[PDB]
């Protein structure tokens, strides 16, 4: 993950973001199913709240 | 429906059915006429103001 800055920012927007497969009860890896993908700031800032 | 660059599939079919009922209410309403304004309305005696 270690990038400049501005590469870190298009890591954090084209490849961090999750995909969970929040339509089933329950939580699952993504189907690849193209649904829409969840940022994670916290994966970026290593910070969990 | 939208276009969309995702490979999830869109709908194929425009134009979803609907079904649908005519529900009656019919109402009713009495009214009595007694049988002396009746047999007075259309008789007439002519025998006093």
């Not at chain 1, 920012?9 to 339509?23: F, S």
């Not at chain 2, 490979?7 to 194929?12: A, K, Q």
Request: some cysteine.
């Amino acid at each position: 993950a270690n990038k400049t800055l501005f590469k870190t920012i298009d890591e954090y927007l084209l490849r961090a973001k999750d995909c969970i497969r929040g339509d089933t009860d329950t939580q699952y890896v993504c189907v690849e199913g193209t649904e829409q993908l969840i940022e994670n700031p916290c994966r970026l800032t290593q910070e969990a709240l | 429906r939208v276009a969309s660059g995702a490979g999830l599939p869109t709908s194929r079919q425009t134009t979803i059915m609907v079904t649908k009922y005519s529900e009656k209410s019919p109402i009713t309403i009495p009214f009595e006429l007694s049988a002396a304004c009746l047999t007075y309305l259309r008789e007439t005696f002519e025998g006093t103001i």
